[PDB]
Amino acid sequence: APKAVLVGLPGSGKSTIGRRLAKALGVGLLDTDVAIEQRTGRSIADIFATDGEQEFRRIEEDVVRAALADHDGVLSLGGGAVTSPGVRAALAGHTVVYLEISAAEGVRRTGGNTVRPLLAGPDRAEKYRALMAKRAPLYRRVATMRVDTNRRNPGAVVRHILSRLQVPSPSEAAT
Ligand SMILES: [Cl-]
């Protein structure tokens, strides 16, 4: 079972924190979005377009269940997995770390390298705030560890998580 399943919105630093965390623990990193493409031979977009959302969500659910069963390291969950009731069921009992950010932090962090994001018009930011309103409540439901990642460096976020994922040395009996 994973040492940690990471969840959060775009902008939360999920990819960089996942890698860093796996590095510090010395464990494997498995990303469910990448795993779906590796198991199907098709892009996320292709599956959506041709089989439809519900079927994408069944395929993802299967992948996530397998990963929770078989992976021992860090599991980075794709952004919409938690909309699936079966995913939220399958997560129960696991260690689930929610990289929590505000709507405003997220907007700022997903603007890219352009210097004047407001000039492209409000639609991208509006769609981002909508997503957060739909996903955030689901992430708070499934979390076992919430981590405030607003204006914190990824290094400090990794330390925070490691301080709360400690494993005692085994007893002589255990050995
Ligand atoms: Cl680190």
UniProtKB/Swiss-Prot annotation:
Q: Which amino acids does the record list as binding Mg(2+)?
A: S15
Subcellular location(s): the record lists: Cytoplasm
- EC number assigned by the record: 2.7.1.71
Q: Which CDD domains match?
A: SK (cd00464)
- Which reaction is recorded as catalysed by this protein? shikimate + ATP = 3-phosphoshikimate + ADP + H(+)
Q: Which family does it belong to?
A: Belongs to the shikimate kinase family.
Q: How does it assemble?
A: Monomer.
The name of this protein is: Shikimate kinase
Provenance organism:
Mycobacterium tuberculosis (strain ATCC 25618 / H37Rv)
